[PDB]
Amino acid sequence: QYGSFCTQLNRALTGIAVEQDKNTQEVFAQVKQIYKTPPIKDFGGFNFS
Amino acid sequence: QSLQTYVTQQLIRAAEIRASANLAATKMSECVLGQSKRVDFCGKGYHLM
Numbered sequence: 001q002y003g004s005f006c007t008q009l010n011r012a013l014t015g016i017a018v019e020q021d022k023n024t025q026e027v028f029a030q031v032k033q034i035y036k037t038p039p040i041k042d043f044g045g046f047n048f049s
Numbered sequence: 050q051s052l053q054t055y056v057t058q059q060l061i062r063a064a065e066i067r068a069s070a071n072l073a074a075t076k077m078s079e080c081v082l083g084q085s086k087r088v089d090f091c092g093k094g095y096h097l098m
């Protein structure tokens with residue numbers, strides 16, 4: 001008898017749920033490929049371990 | 050109660066739209082009126098105009 005008050009709450013929560021994944025994708029999916037460092041660590045004395 | 054819910058939702062959406070508009074205004078100011086140096090702000094790659 002309270003109408004469709006439920007649907008908007010469900011919709012808003014779903015929107016937040018999608019927004020979180022959108023944020024993660026935007027902030028990290030910045031490179032189209034995958035690179036790997038060479039096994040040799042000869043960087044003129046610079047250490048990145 | 051229904052009207053209150055609608056008003057609150059509209060206010061939040063308006064805030065989001067204002068943020069988007071501010072970003073758009075900065076983009077128009079920098080990527081169009083001149084040559085930008087920030088990378089990926091005015092499209093992928095080196096920006097020209």
Ligand SMILES: *[C@@H]1O[C@H](CO)[C@@H](O[C@@H]2O[C@H](CO)[C@@H](O)[C@H](O)[C@H]2NC(C)=O)[C@H](O)[C@H]1NC(C)=O
Binds near residue numbers: 047048
């Ligand atoms: C890069 O730095 C790491 C430490 O951050 C070095 O690892 C150390 O190596 C010495 C001897 O090989 C050990 O006694 C230490 O216990 C190691 N520390 C750690 C945290 O593992 C590593 O040798 C450095 N590599 C280069 C090429 O400089």
